[PDB]
Subunit: 231 residues, 6 copies
């Protein structure tokens, strides 16, 4: 089997790592995800991963209590590094070479993000996990995925979601769209600022379903899974 992508940026939601309790990190659901990535690696795909922090930091309640927006996003930012930290470990236990990089330098914990060092690592069959989003508050994990995606010169961003693509009860799942077509039809693919970044840099986005078994493997094979977004 051959893949239509040599280098991808896989974007996970923090919740993707949640267990039944609807929070934290579930070891098995995580090792499962490590294996899915091990496949992509073995198919010769260079994999950058960007994780969110929703499973470790909600903070909707703290926002309600009046918590400063910036401080809130800094907490989420750290949350994403815990997830990345866990994922890098999960991969090493799956005998996959992996590095964790952080937008916010964390001395002794993981190396600081460098677009160049990331490319170098990906070219050496290292999975590169990219943490702490953009380094700034008020930017979604999507924004970070696209920014990183563009920097590391990925062929595509794979937004792993709970839904099986972009949908028009009835109607139908789109199969392909354009950046213009998505704005025009007012479809919810991702945060508008993140979307603009991908559009302006002609970075293809594939929305798919991480829960649909082997869906990831298929998205890479080029096969029709979820929606693709290009132009």
């Amino acid at each position: 089997a051959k893949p239509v992508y040599k280098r991808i940026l896989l974007k996970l939601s923090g919740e993707a790592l949640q267990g039944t309790e609807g929070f934290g990190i579930d070891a098995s659901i995580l090792d499962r995800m490590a294996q899915e990535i091990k496949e992509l690696v073995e198919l010769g795909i260079q994999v950058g991963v960007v994780i969110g922090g929703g499973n470790l930091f909600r903070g909707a309640g703290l926002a309600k209590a009046g918590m400063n927006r910036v401080v809130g996003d800094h907490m989420g930012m750290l949350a994403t590094v815990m997830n990345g930290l866990a994922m890098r470990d999960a991969l090493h236990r799956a005998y996959v070479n992996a590095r964790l990089m952080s937008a916010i330098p964390l001395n002794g914990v993981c190396d600081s993000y460098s677009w160049a060092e990331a490319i170098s690592l990906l070219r050496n069959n290292r999975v590169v996990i990219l943490s702490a989003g953009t380094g700034n508050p008020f930017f979604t994990t999507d924004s970070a995925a696209c920014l990183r995606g563009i920097e590391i010169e990925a062929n595509v961003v794979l937004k792993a979601t709970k839904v099986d693509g972009v949908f028009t009860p009835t109607a139908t799942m789109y199969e392909q769209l354009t950046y213009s077509e998505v704005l025009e039809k007012e479809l919810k693919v991702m945060d508008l600022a993140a979307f603009t970044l991908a559009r302006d840099h002609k970075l293809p986005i594939r929305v798919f379903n991480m829960n649909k078994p082997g869906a990831l493997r298929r998205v890479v094979m080029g096969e029709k899974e979820g929606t693709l977004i290009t132009e």
Copy 2:
């Protein structure tokens, strides 16, 4: 009254900020804690706080799955910074001046720990929250509390726990009122991690174990009044 301590290091367990769900940060339980600290500040006490990360990172399950011990502690270390981040915010919302410092520099998020800058801040009626423990793995939050306690030249470390001192599971027990470092090792009592305890002992840093859940217990511990156990020599 008059506080018998001009500078204390209050050590909280991460769980201290947990809600009913037994995880995360509960806004009300947190703002409550900010208020308790606002009191100590208003009494003219200089307050350093050291928080753990247990409420945000358990990772006993990940350890079970074979997660590297170092990576595990690094996750907890970050966890403690989220708690500190939350607490600093909670205090500013209670109109208390507060700084967050981290053993691991976090550019743009909070300033890097400096024993000197910490003292300077405490002397300016800033509550100083100390995050990311010692900066190293394999050191308990207790160890960090003592280390920081000694560095900032605190008069005492207040270990806030769920129990009312050193002794509701056996009808045959009695709360100590004061002990010595030697007396605690000898009687094999569980005050805190042994490495942490040694650090306090060797630097003659008094430890007060008390009950954060017992209302006003904190206020009392400071007044000098008899609350929980004291440990000196």
Copy 3:
């Protein structure tokens, strides 16, 4: 009068500091700008400034030659710090207290950005210059201005431009072009008006950060924008 803003984020284009030669930094055009800011400070306004790097780095030619986009923006990012560096100096020579902060820490050159430290400095009658944009490539100086603006809790972002606000059409080329006085984020997207980069605009919209586009070349226009008087366009909702 009385300024309707206690804290503003003034966003300058790098070119704003250009001389006649259309590049670099012109000492007099810079000292003038320092004076304009000295006024706002004296009126008791807390001033954050965000500068671009267009006057020091073009690099359209290098992009044409195939230069990597990231590297290009990093060069621009450094460019903005040179401008900030020059501006902080110009202000100290105008006896205005000023700090330079950078999104990319520059040991010994200026302090690293911290939203908190920025607020603290503004509250102490320091002009805070914010350099190196967002710290990332592919983000405009506008994006940086809004992001910083929201972080330091500014009341408004003042986009200083060469035009006197937002026009129904273009003024410099069309005699039917007239000037809006106020718009809404929705109204700007709907009427497809060019206020600023879309990503930057979304940031301001989602955080209800008012934007005032005005003309830095129109003498005293800055002073007026602050007085609340009608200068250029305002954008709120």
Copy 4:
């Protein structure tokens, strides 16, 4: 032929990258410089480059207006990093492996200078570009080239200039002639303008050979390396 140098430190003036407009970076003048370096690399030479910032920051006018000297030099320092940034990119587009290092750490932009990491990189056929001078103000780009040159244990510093070596008299004074070799003592004695005195002292005290040559003279660089007689050499 065979290069008489295994490791050199090439020192460029920022202006070396200027276009016709007398400022900025000209893509073509830069890509040709990348190609000149690609040659040295494929001759098996280890190349460290030190660039100035004159093309991106003049600031004589701002000095005149009273700008603080330190701030001025910090601006130039950043300027050199922009040049280095451009040069590293130019080399990668010429399929030459290259790293940018900065005396002032720049998180995420390029790695921090380390004399040791520099040598390691040079030994792996990486061109190592060294930016932000010495990290300090009041030190010329020449000073940085010598300092770096000594640190990375280069065999020679190649000061690329607009003139074809050191002349008995001012070239652009029709009665001038070109030296072929001098000594540090001979240069101070004859009061010749090779480079800033502080920089020169550094090279002298560490017996670091300096070759002044003409970057505009085609293939002059290739020749300086071959050992052939181009511009002036300075040793002892």
Copy 5:
């Protein structure tokens, strides 16, 4: 023979590098030590070294004069980096690949400690010297050796000392004195034996990190400790 250890953490006292004058660094005593390590490297052992700073900073006199304890330990911390700096150099002169890492980042001098980068380097036949202890004051070099030892996943910590192991009672002031050969963490606390600082010891115990106390002065003792042969005391459980 065959080394019973694939990765060790060798802990030296700063004094280990002292000359006759009882201070500083003696080139020959250092090059000697570099050679001992070159052996371990050639036997295929991955070697992490942790050095103290006692030879370069005493400061008992400054403590006496009232010097702040923290400041004192920071001076010692820097001291250890000077030793590590010297040792890395000594090894390169012995044609041994070696990296210096510091708990306190030292831009341009050596790279910052990273448990992961340390392991990577050891796996590439680099000797990894670990400096500045734990990065904190009030922690002994022993504590640093154990912490590092655990982090880099060493099989054993080799505490090189002036004595030939752990003794029941002093061997030169008692004829019935028999140097232990093996102990347990519990056995050492129980018998109240001085192996190392209590905090450091607890760290090794809780992580089941074997400790071998031996004599660096006894020629070839190091080589033997590694061979598995019975030199000095071992401490496990």
Copy 6:
């Protein structure tokens, strides 16, 4: 009296802190030096100090053994920070406000050098100790003193030496009283490293060479009185 200098950069040799044993740091010789500086502070002088590392690192022997020159200078660089560390402490024990800055950032130990932050500190009656020289190898402590001197806009660099100024080991020798940069190069006099000297010359930074051992000599150099040699133009 009235000091003819509002801001000075005092350059000490590391050896200046040596005891009888000819190495290390002698507590009393150090506290003595702290007091001399306390005076200058009390006279309203802003004091920047630059210390060398000779007392803590010789390394002529290690150079002889083939040690890399860079590594050697890095060791000395660290040495200077130990001295500065000791001096900052000595000053706080003499109730003098003092900050330590390093050309090489040392997280948690002391703050990173910033020419601006240095000036700010000096203007707030802080003695500012400047460590790790220029941050680079192959630069003398003199070079660092001048560079720092120029950056912090000092009026003068006071090179404290063992000799009482610049002299014409001789029966026939007279102490100069004032020279010029040109006059010093011309007469081939040993004031300081040539690179360092050039820096001071090109920036018209006055240098006063004097004798730290001559009691009250420092106090006098500041009063404007004739002590050791002055070098200007």
